[PDB]
Amino acid sequence: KVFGRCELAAAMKRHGLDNYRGYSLGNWVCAAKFESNFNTQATNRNTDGSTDYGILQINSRWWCNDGRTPGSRNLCNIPCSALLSSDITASVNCAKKIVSDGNGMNAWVAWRNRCKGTDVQAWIRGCRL
């Protein structure tokens, strides 16, 4: 599923991401835009052989099992394919684990490089939230 901007913001708000660990909703929408272009089916293979999955490009080295990242962990206790669902519940629940891990949203390279320090509230402007 390719989300609309406001559609995704409303879905993220319902799932408890607004101000989660202090990160306002716009941060999460901005991260999703640049990680996946709002596409739940996005996958990208990394140099180390791990793969990033879903709307928040959650990596198989640490967070989900895809059966082909040897020596990796599955800290969200899910198959990585669960992160590609049109239902973003699994991605959001795993993202809450990631953002609580100590490095905040810096775990998302696109957030650090393209959202951090910008007017992220622009990503939710105009939406009926």
Side-chain angles (χ1 to χ4, degrees):
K1 164 166 185 62
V2 179
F3 278 81
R5 177 173 64 89
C6 294
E7 180 186 24
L8 180 62
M12 280 173 164
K13 184 190 189 122
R14 179 169 74 91
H15 280 96
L17 283 182
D18 191 15
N19 303 323
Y20 190 84
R21 298 273 298 181
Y23 288 93
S24 68
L25 199 52
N27 283 282
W28 296 101
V29 175
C30 187
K33 167 79 193 171
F34 293 123
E35 288 293 347
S36 67
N37 202 32
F38 299 145
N39 186 355
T40 66
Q41 293 196 78
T43 60
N44 291 281
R45 191 92 198 251
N46 302 125
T47 306
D48 66 358
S50 64
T51 302
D52 295 338
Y53 294 87
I55 199 151
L56 286 168
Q57 288 291 276
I58 288 173
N59 184 263
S60 63
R61 178 65 65 192
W62 299 105
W63 303 108
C64 60
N65 173 65
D66 64 4
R68 61 168 205 189
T69 313
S72 61
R73 294 177 66 188
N74 179 10
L75 290 168
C76 290
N77 303 293
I78 48 169
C80 296
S81 58
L83 301 175
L84 306 180
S85 176
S86 49
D87 183 337
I88 66 167
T89 294
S91 285
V92 172
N93 285 350
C94 189
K96 289 176 171 174
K97 288 302 316 153
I98 298 173
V99 72
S100 302
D101 202 38
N103 313 130
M105 275 200 85
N106 296 292
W108 286 277
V109 173
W111 180 83
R112 277 194 299 120
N113 289 332
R114 305 180 77 176
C115 302
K116 191 181 187 174
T118 74
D119 180 21
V120 294
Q121 293 177 335
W123 288 101
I124 56 171
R125 295 198 194 131
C127 305
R128 150 194 239 13
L129 294 163

